[PDB]
Amino acid sequence: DKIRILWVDDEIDLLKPHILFLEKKNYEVTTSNNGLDAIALFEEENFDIVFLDENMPGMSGLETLSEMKEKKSAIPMIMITKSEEEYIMEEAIGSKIADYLIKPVNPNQILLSLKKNLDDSRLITEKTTLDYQKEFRKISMELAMVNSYEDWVELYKKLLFWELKLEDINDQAMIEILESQKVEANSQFGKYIERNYEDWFAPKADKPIQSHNLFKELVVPEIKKKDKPILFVVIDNLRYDQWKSFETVISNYYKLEKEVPYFSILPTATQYARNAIFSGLMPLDMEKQFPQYWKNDVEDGGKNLYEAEFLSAQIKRLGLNIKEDYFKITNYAGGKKLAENFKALKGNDLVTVVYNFVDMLSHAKTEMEVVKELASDDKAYRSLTLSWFKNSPLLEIIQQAQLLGFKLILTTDHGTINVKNPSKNLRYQKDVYVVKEPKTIGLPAINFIFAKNDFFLAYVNNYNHYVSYYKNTYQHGGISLEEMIIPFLVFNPK
Amino acid sequence: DKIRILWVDDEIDLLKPHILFLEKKNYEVTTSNNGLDAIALFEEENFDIVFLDENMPGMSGLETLSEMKEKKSAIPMIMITKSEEEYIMEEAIGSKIADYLIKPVNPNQILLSLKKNLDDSRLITEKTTLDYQKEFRKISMELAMVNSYEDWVELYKKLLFWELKLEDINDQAMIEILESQKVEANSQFGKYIERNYEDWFAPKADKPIQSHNLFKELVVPEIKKKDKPILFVVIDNLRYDQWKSFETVISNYYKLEKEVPYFSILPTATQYARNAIFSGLMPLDMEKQFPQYWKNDVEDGGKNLYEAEFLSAQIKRLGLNIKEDYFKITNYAGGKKLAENFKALKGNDLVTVVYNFVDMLSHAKTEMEVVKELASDDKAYRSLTLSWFKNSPLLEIIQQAQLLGFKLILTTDHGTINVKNPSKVVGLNLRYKTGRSLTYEQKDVYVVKEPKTIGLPAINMSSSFIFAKNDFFLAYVNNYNHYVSYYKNTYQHGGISLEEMIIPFLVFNPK
Ligand SMILES: [Zn+2]
Ligand SMILES: [Zn+2]
Ligand SMILES: [Zn+2]
Ligand SMILES: [Zn+2]
Ligand SMILES: [Zn+2]
């Protein structure tokens, strides 16, 4: 199949050099000297691409383009014209032209435009596969050398970068190399975390920023600037890769000012960690200082329901005085509502939204066949997350906040990981990091265990049932890059 | 805030004409004659766009581009070079270059490239907003004038066209105008179908292609070509808008040869319409000719267990002797399986896949909050459907079929509609009921006291069909409030709407 071009120009006879040039390159050119005839051909026959002049005696190129797009939407159209006027440029681009070449045109420019517009997917696939072939041994080397938390953050960035670059490619060998680097990364990370995690809670220890330090050290400073109100959005259970999947959408409305990967405390679960975000305290200290608010595992009723109170208390412990409002969205109507009425809180200095939809979505894969098919692989989950965010009540809230000139601070409590391997909440033996003293961590317990790598805890009784139902499900609470290294972002409104 | 360009060329001093030209147009140009300097600037300072020569002393443009993309991913890079070599072109494009301009360059070409790469989202939004302002009153007019099935197909095309276009608009006012055009369109369509549907089943009558003649009239011709094996996918419950939302994905692998909007029989439900596709017969005739296969509503069990048998019979009635196999995917593993092992089907002349995921998904809005938030509005459902298809086992099957040089025929049994308004009824589905004696709001439905006339079977000789119009859902008065609260804003099918009844038939040739 030679690629079939329809070329429409009143002065087509003058373009025979260009046509000859293209035909020699296995391009088939049908020509036409008016838009009406071209539309007729464009309907009868199936062309791969159309070239259009702007100024023609009858219908203009842009008019011809309109009639053509109505009839067969997804055929790429290129404009080749003398018009150098900005307003025609703008009308072409506004019409979703694929490219606009000003005459007299270098014939190779046209060829470049054919390659870019018809071949770019496979070319990008080729170049990306070869780029990774040349890069991946450096990545194995770098991983071996990491022994710092600052260095763990860098390496995760690299893996995330290449994850999205390769997500499209179809070369099994290189896909598996990347999987194996990601597995090895977690195995190394788990050893790292168990080796220095306890040491981190000792006085004078060089330490990553964690859950219990988050509000104190990264939120307070941006408030005390005192230029603009701050919208704080804690999106529950958001992996770094999911942030990355919708970074371009959000950037239409917000410009990233500051980005800081941080380390969520163990366990990587809402009640233990999200409460810590709002309290400025480790679990143990929340039990000590607020026994009427803190809830222990064995307690029924549900968790994370006094975050507002934890937060208000922290603000005064710091000594800061501000107007503060806190909300927790747990369903559609909820978030839809808070979008329509976001107006009212302008005068409020800080606004805090907790959004639980992504956790609900991650957990839904466990039970619903539908979600299994929507989130079969990580790529699919990132894709689905993007479909979500683009049409979320959460984006509406974000869109309102910019119109009010709020600075946005966007973060999460922890991520989630696809669990693959059983070991006898499903993440909290070399398979586990034991802490037979809890105060050493700052965890409460009378008189904690954290799964590493891909592991999920399956009880000896009903071991098979646990294995078969929870295999290849998103769980959290343990130690993985995906769970524990999580974004903290400040943005300025556009 | 001027747009800041970083321009890297060993011969940058030679390019001052171009710089002056751009600076006059409120572009700020920082220049550099080496990749290493350029990388330094690119880190210190924040640029909007980068221009790059290919052949420089020291670091190459493409090497410079790679260091730059690693650091700040979404900044567009444009190559302006003397190199006309195809392999550099290919490397540049593969490296995700945003354009490649061959020197000597017309300075306006650069400007065009700046506009295309920096302004295009705004420009498309402006053009679309203004073009709909100018077009929408023509659409109201056209809808008033619609007097035929061929004319209903054209109008639906226009609504669909504009509905996807006004996704990249952010203007409620015009979005509401288009909703109200779609409501009005359905109202009109319902009355149209009520008025002509029975006439269609009379001898000689000018008629759209429907469910029962689909395979005979549009699939058989492709088979008798005998030039390629055919993969025949029936994606259950696929609205035209959803097809349109993934038309560009499929086109990477398949080139559309033929497209034919067609009219699903009433009721617009799997049990009637899909079986009709495979049988070549209206429901009544399937009762007559195949009583061991056909089922009425009242009977327990699935209502499409026997499609393979219906299909094999049709194939021999037409006197084709074909190697043909049928599969019915009802879950992930199912579809995953058929993808990994599709190659076994090489020898087949015809392969038929039925894929039920979209129906399951549409119905899941009823049940799951998560799907409610994912498919809150049509746009969201289209978006979700695209996320689905892009990562579906079904695309894997399609991808295999291309590698084996199959012709693809893609279609559906019927669409679904978001129901908003309750309509009371006494006596299974929510857009159609069947029963000996029924009471119901007359205007809201299309009643047929004599089913056989429209090729549907009667149970008793009082048994009658009703089909809900517009966005109605038939709600029992027993527990009326609970039906209203649970089924409001849910995807239902079986009745009369553009979304339900007008559905695509697509033939494609492999790339
Ligand atoms: Zn001309
Ligand atoms: Zn959480
Ligand atoms: Zn959870
Ligand atoms: Zn040079
Ligand atoms: Zn259904």
Give B454-474 as a 3 state SS string. Answer: HCCCCCCCCCEEEEECCCEEE
What is d(CA B292, CA B312) in angstroms, rounded to the nearest whole number? Answer: 15
What single-letter amino acid sits at B89?
M
Contact B427, B433 (CB under 8 A): yes
Which of B90, B120, B361 minimises the CB distance to A115? B90
Q: Do B161 and A73 touch (CB under 8 A)?
A: yes
Instruction: Report DSSP state, residue A479.
Output: B
Q: Where are the alpha helices (DSSP H) in B146-273?
A: 149-165, 172-200, 214, 220-223, 240-245, 247-250
**Residue-wise DSSP of A145-200:** H--SHHHHHHHHHHHHHHHHHHTT---HHHHHHHHHHHHHHHHHHHHHHHHHHHHH
Contact B445, B468 (CB under 8 A): yes
What is d(CA B449, CA B452) in angstroms, rounded to the nearest whole number? Answer: 9
Decide if A276 is inside a domain.
yes
Residues A169 and A278 in one domain: no
Select the residue from B93, B102, B117, B118 to test the A interface by mutation, using most A Cβ atoms within 10 A.
B93
Task: Give the gap in angstroms from C-alpha A304 to the nearest C-alpha of chain B.
Answer: 21
Residues A286 and A339 in one domain: yes
Give the CA dihedral A45, A47, A51, A54, nearest 10 degrees. Answer: 40
Q: How many CB pairs under 8 A join A and B?
A: 159
Residue recorded with tokens 């999205």: A164
As given in the structure block, the two tokens for residue A443 are 């965890």
Which of A200, A226, A256 lies at the terminal end of a domain, its last residue? A200
Select the residue from A370, A396, A472 to test the B interface by mutation, using most B Cβ atoms within 10 A.
A370
- Closest ligand relative to A483 C-alpha: 2
Which of A168, A200, A232 lies at the terminal end of a domain, its last residue? A200
A212 is in an annotated binding site: no
Q: What resolution, expressed in A, was reported for this entry? A: 2.7
Contact A442, A436 (CB under 8 A): no
Select the residue from A235, A245, A248, A373 to test the B interface by mutation, using most B Cβ atoms within 10 A.
A373
Peptide bond into A104 cis (omega under 30): yes
Residues B285 and B169 in one domain: no
Interacting residues of B45 by C-beta distance below 8 A, sequence separation 6+: B4, B6, B30
Interacting residues of A447 by C-beta distance below 8 A, sequence separation 6+: none
Distance from the Cα of residue A455 to its chain's centroid: 24
What is d(CA B195, CA A370) in angstroms, rounded to the nearest whole number? Answer: 39
CA-nearest residue to A167 within chain B is B391
Interacting residues of B275 by C-beta distance below 8 A, sequence separation 6+: B283, B286, B294, B303, B304, B306, B307, B310
Decide if B469 is inside a domain.
no
Contact A351, A345 (CB under 8 A): yes
Distance A175 CA to ligand 5 centre (A): 38
Decide if A388 is inside a domain.
yes
Peptide bond into B267 cis (omega under 30): yes
Residues A425 and A467 in one domain: yes
What is d(CA B463, CA A257) in angstroms, rounded to the nearest whole number? Answer: 69
Contact B82, B64 (CB under 8 A): no
What is d(CA A242, CA A410) in angstroms, rounded to the nearest whole number? Answer: 13
Identify which of B148, B355, B371 has the alpha carbon closest to the alpha carbon of residue B236.
B355
What is d(CA B311, CA B313) in angstroms, rounded to the nearest whole number? Answer: 5
Neighbouring C-beta atoms of residue A178, cutoff 10 Å:
19
Contact B158, B182 (CB under 8 A): no
Q: What Rg do the C-alpha atoms of chain B give, in angstroms? A: 28
Residues B252 and B378 in one domain: yes
Distance A35 CA to ligand 1 centre (A): 12
Identify which of B442, B385, B444, B448 has the alpha carbon closest to the alpha carbon of residue B420.
B444
CA atoms within 13 A on the CB side of A94: 19
Residues A74 and A128 in one domain: no
Contact A370, A315 (CB under 8 A): no
The β-bridge partners of B230 are: B350, B407
What is d(CA B341, CA B338) in angstroms, rounded to the nearest whole number? Answer: 5
CA distance to A239, B215, B505, per residue, from B262 (Å): 44, 12, 7
Q: Do B106 and A84 touch (CB under 8 A)?
A: yes
Residues B162 and B259 in one domain: no
The β-bridge partners of B490 are: B419
Q: What are phi and psi of B181, to 5 degrees?
A: -65, -40
What is d(CA A74, CA A63) in angstroms, rounded to the nearest whole number? Answer: 17
Do strands A27-32 and A49-52 pair parallel, antiparallel, or not at all (unpaired)? unpaired
Q: What are phi and psi of B377, to 5 degrees?
A: -125, 170
CA distance to A127, A163, A431, per residue, from A123 (Å): 6, 18, 42
Q: Do B391 and A383 touch (CB under 8 A)?
A: yes
B171 is in an annotated binding site: no
Identify which of B341, B326, B307, B95 has the alpha carbon closest to the alpha carbon of residue A129.
B95
Q: What are phi and psi of A251, to 5 degrees?
A: -70, -15
3-state helix, strand, coil in chain A (%, to 5): 50, 20, 30
Distance B52 CA to ligand 4 centre (A): 10
Contact A402, A493 (CB under 8 A): yes
Distance A442 CA to ligand 3 centre (A): 21
Contact B326, B307 (CB under 8 A): yes
Residue recorded with tokens 């703008």: A90
Which of A93, A361, A370 minimises the CB distance to B115? A93
Q: What are phi and psi of B113, to 5 degrees?
A: -70, -35
What is d(CA A179, CA A116) in angstroms, rounded to the nearest whole number? Answer: 31
What is d(CA B392, CA B335) in angstroms, rounded to the nearest whole number? Answer: 9
Interacting residues of B373 by C-beta distance below 8 A, sequence separation 6+: A331, A332, A335, A357, A388, A392, A393
As given in the structure block, the two tokens for residue A18 are 């260009």
B378 is in an annotated binding site: no
Identify which of B139, B119, B142, B130 has the alpha carbon closest to the alpha carbon of residue B166.
B130
Experimental technique used to determine this entry:
X-ray
Name the burial class of residue B249, with classes exposed (0-12), middle (13-18) and buried (19+) by CB atoms within 10 angstroms of its CB.
middle
**What range defines the domain where residue B270 resides?**
211-417+500-510
Residues of A in contact with B392 (CB under 8 A): 373
What is d(CA B406, CA B198) in angstroms, rounded to the nearest whole number? Answer: 38
What is d(CA A91, CA A66) in angstroms, rounded to the nearest whole number? Answer: 11
**Residue-wise DSSP of B100-134:** EEESS--HHHHHHHHHHHHHHHHHHHHHHHHHHHH
Distance in angstroms between the alpha carbons of the first and the last residue of chain A: 48
Interacting residues of B316 by C-beta distance below 8 A, sequence separation 6+: none
What is d(CA B40, CA A37) in angstroms, rounded to the nearest whole number? Answer: 54
Distance A427 CA to ligand 3 centre (A): 11
Give the CA dihedral A189, A195, A200, A205, nearest 10 degrees. Answer: -110
Decide if A112 is inside a domain.
no
What is d(CA B289, CA B310) in angstroms, rounded to the nearest whole number? Answer: 10
Region at B264 (left for phi over 0; alpha for psi -120 to 50; beta for the rest): beta
Decide if B455 is inside a domain.
no
Task: Give the gap in angstroms from C-alpha B120 to the nearest C-alpha of chain A.
Answer: 6
Residue burial B90-120, b: 16+ Cβ < 10 Å; e: rest = bbbbbbbbbbbbbbebbbbbbbbbbbbbbbe
What is d(CA A42, CA A50) in angstroms, rounded to the nearest whole number? Answer: 9
What is d(CA A373, CA A375) in angstroms, rounded to the nearest whole number? Answer: 6
Identify which of A169, A210, A247, A268 has the alpha carbon closest to the alpha carbon of residue A474.
A268
N residues, chain A: 494
What is d(CA B389, CA B243) in angstroms, rounded to the nearest whole number? Answer: 10
Decide if A186 is inside a domain.
yes
Distance B78 CA to ligand 5 centre (A): 49
Q: Do A74 and B247 touch (CB under 8 A)?
A: yes
Q: Tell me which H or E stretch contains B255.
A: strand B254-263
Residues B287 and B410 in one domain: yes
Interacting residues of B449 by C-beta distance below 8 A, sequence separation 6+: B464
Task: Give the gap in angstroms from C-alpha A440 to the nearest C-alpha of chain B.
Answer: 39
Interacting residues of A252 by C-beta distance below 8 A, sequence separation 6+: A494, B121
Q: Do A368 and B368 touch (CB under 8 A)?
A: yes
Residues B175 and B124 in one domain: yes
Instruction: Report DSSP state, residue B270.
Output: I
Residue recorded with tokens 């119109």: A403
Contact B21, B63 (CB under 8 A): no
Identify which of A210, A133, A211 has the alpha carbon closest to the alpha carbon of residue A176.
A133
Distance A374 CA to ligand 2 centre (A): 21
CA-nearest residue to B75 within chain A is A248
What's the CATH code of the domain at B16? 3.40.50.2300
What is d(CA B317, CA B10) in angstroms, rounded to the nearest whole number? Answer: 75
Distance in angstroms between the alpha carbons of the first and the last residue of chain B: 46
Neighbouring C-beta atoms of residue A434, cutoff 10 Å:
10
Residue recorded with tokens 């000996």: B436
Q: Do B115 and A357 touch (CB under 8 A)?
A: no
Residue recorded with tokens 């291309």: B402
Which of A100, A361, A393 minimises the CB distance to B370? A361
Ion ligand 4 neighbours (CB, 5 A) are B 10, 53, 55
A176 is in an annotated binding site: no
Sheet of A3-8: strands edge to edge? A27-32, A3-8, A49-52, A77-81, A99-102
What is d(CA A424, CA A22) in angstroms, rounded to the nearest whole number? Answer: 67
Residues A285 and A390 in one domain: yes
CA distance to A381, A392, B330, B381, per residue, from B376 (Å): 19, 9, 24, 7
Interacting residues of A134 by C-beta distance below 8 A, sequence separation 6+: none
Interacting residues of B150 by C-beta distance below 8 A, sequence separation 6+: none
Residues of A in contact with B394 (CB under 8 A): none
Q: Do A95 and B127 touch (CB under 8 A)?
A: yes
CA atoms within 13 A on the CB side of A313: 16
Which of A99, A332, A369 minimises the CB distance to B373? A332
Identify which of A246, A493, A494 has the alpha carbon closest to the alpha carbon of residue A390.
A246
Decide if A320 is inside a domain.
yes
Residues of A in contact with B100 (CB under 8 A): 112, 116
N residues, chain B: 511
CA distance to A162, A238, A411, B116, B272, per residue, from A359 (Å): 25, 8, 14, 39, 40
Distance A81 CA to ligand 1 centre (A): 7
Interacting residues of A31 by C-beta distance below 8 A, sequence separation 6+: A6, A7, A8, A9, A12, A19
What is d(CA B179, CA B208) in angstroms, rounded to the nearest whole number? Answer: 26
The β-bridge partners of B350 are: B230, B324
Distance from the Cα of residue B52 to its chain's centroid: 39
CA-nearest residue to A372 within chain B is B332
Identify which of A83, A104, A112, A123 has the alpha carbon closest to the alpha carbon of residue A22.
A112
What is d(CA A322, CA A342) in angstroms, rounded to the nearest whole number? Answer: 18
What single-letter amino acid sits at A266?
L
What is d(CA A325, CA A345) in angstroms, rounded to the nearest whole number? Answer: 8
B237 is in an annotated binding site: yes
Which of B90, B357, B376 minimises the CB distance to A332? B376
Q: Do A89 and B112 touch (CB under 8 A)?
A: yes
Residue recorded with tokens 């586990």: A432
What single-letter amino acid sits at B144?
A
A228 is in an annotated binding site: no
Residues of A in contact with B74 (CB under 8 A): 247-248, 251
Which of B100, B123, B364 minimises the CB distance to A93? B123
Instruction: Report DSSP state, residue B202.
Output: S
Residues B505 and B393 in one domain: yes
- Sign of the alpha-carbon dihedral angle for A451, A452, A456, A459: negative
Residue recorded with tokens 């459902």: B381
Q: 3-state class of A246 per DSSP?
A: coil
Number of separate domains in chain B? 3
Distance from the Cα of residue A226 to its chain's centroid: 30
Decide if A404 is inside a domain.
yes
Across chain B, which distance is largest between two alpha carbons, in Å? 92
Across chain A, which distance is largest between two alpha carbons, in Å? 93
Interacting residues of A183 by C-beta distance below 8 A, sequence separation 6+: A453, A454
A131 is in an annotated binding site: no
What is d(CA A56, CA A11) in angstroms, rounded to the nearest whole number? Answer: 9
Distance from the Cα of residue A307 to its chain's centroid: 26
> Contacts for B165-169 with beta carbons within 8 Å, 24 or more apart?
B165/B128, B165/B132, B166/B128, B166/B132, B167/B379, B167/B382, B168/B121, B168/B124, B168/B125, B168/B128, B169/B125, B169/B128, B169/B129, B169/B132
What's the CATH code of the domain at A399? 3.40.720.10
Distance from the Cα of residue A181 to its chain's centroid: 21
Contact A42, A68 (CB under 8 A): yes
CA distance to A56, A234, A315, B468, per residue, from A311 (Å): 68, 13, 6, 53
CA-nearest residue to A111 within chain B is B86
Which of A109, A128, A390 minimises the CB distance to B383? A390
The β-bridge partners of B234 are: B354, B411
Interacting residues of B34 by C-beta distance below 8 A, sequence separation 6+: B8, B10, B56, B57, B58, B59
What is d(CA B88, CA B86) in angstroms, rounded to the nearest whole number? Answer: 6
What is d(CA B357, CA B234) in angstroms, rounded to the nearest whole number? Answer: 11
What is d(CA B467, CA A335) in angstroms, rounded to the nearest whole number? Answer: 36
Interacting residues of B359 by C-beta distance below 8 A, sequence separation 6+: B236, B237, B270, B416
Name the burial class of residue A203, with classes exposed (0-12), middle (13-18) and buried (19+) by CB atoms within 10 angstroms of its CB.
exposed
Q: Do B369 and A331 touch (CB under 8 A)?
A: yes
Contact A433, A190 (CB under 8 A): yes
CA atoms within 13 A on the CB side of A455: 23
Residue burial A459-491, b: 16+ Cβ < 10 Å; e: rest = eeeeeeebeeebeebbbbbbbbbbbbbbbbbbb
Residues B74 and B127 in one domain: no
Identify which of B340, B306, B315, B336 has the alpha carbon closest to the alpha carbon of residue B230.
B315
Which of B73, B105, B137 lies at the terminal end of a domain, its last residue? B105
Interacting residues of B223 by C-beta distance below 8 A, sequence separation 6+: B230, B320, B322, B349, B350
Distance A260 CA to ligand 1 centre (A): 55
Q: Tell me which H or E stretch contains A105.
A: none
Task: Give the gap in angstroms from C-alpha B257 to the nearest C-alpha of chain A.
Answer: 7
- Closest ligand relative to A269 C-alpha: 2
Q: After which residues is chain A broken (C to N over 2.5 A)?
A: 424, 428, 447
Residues of B in contact with A387 (CB under 8 A): 374, 380, 383-384, 386-387
Sheet of B439-440: strands edge to edge? B439-440, B421-426, B472-476
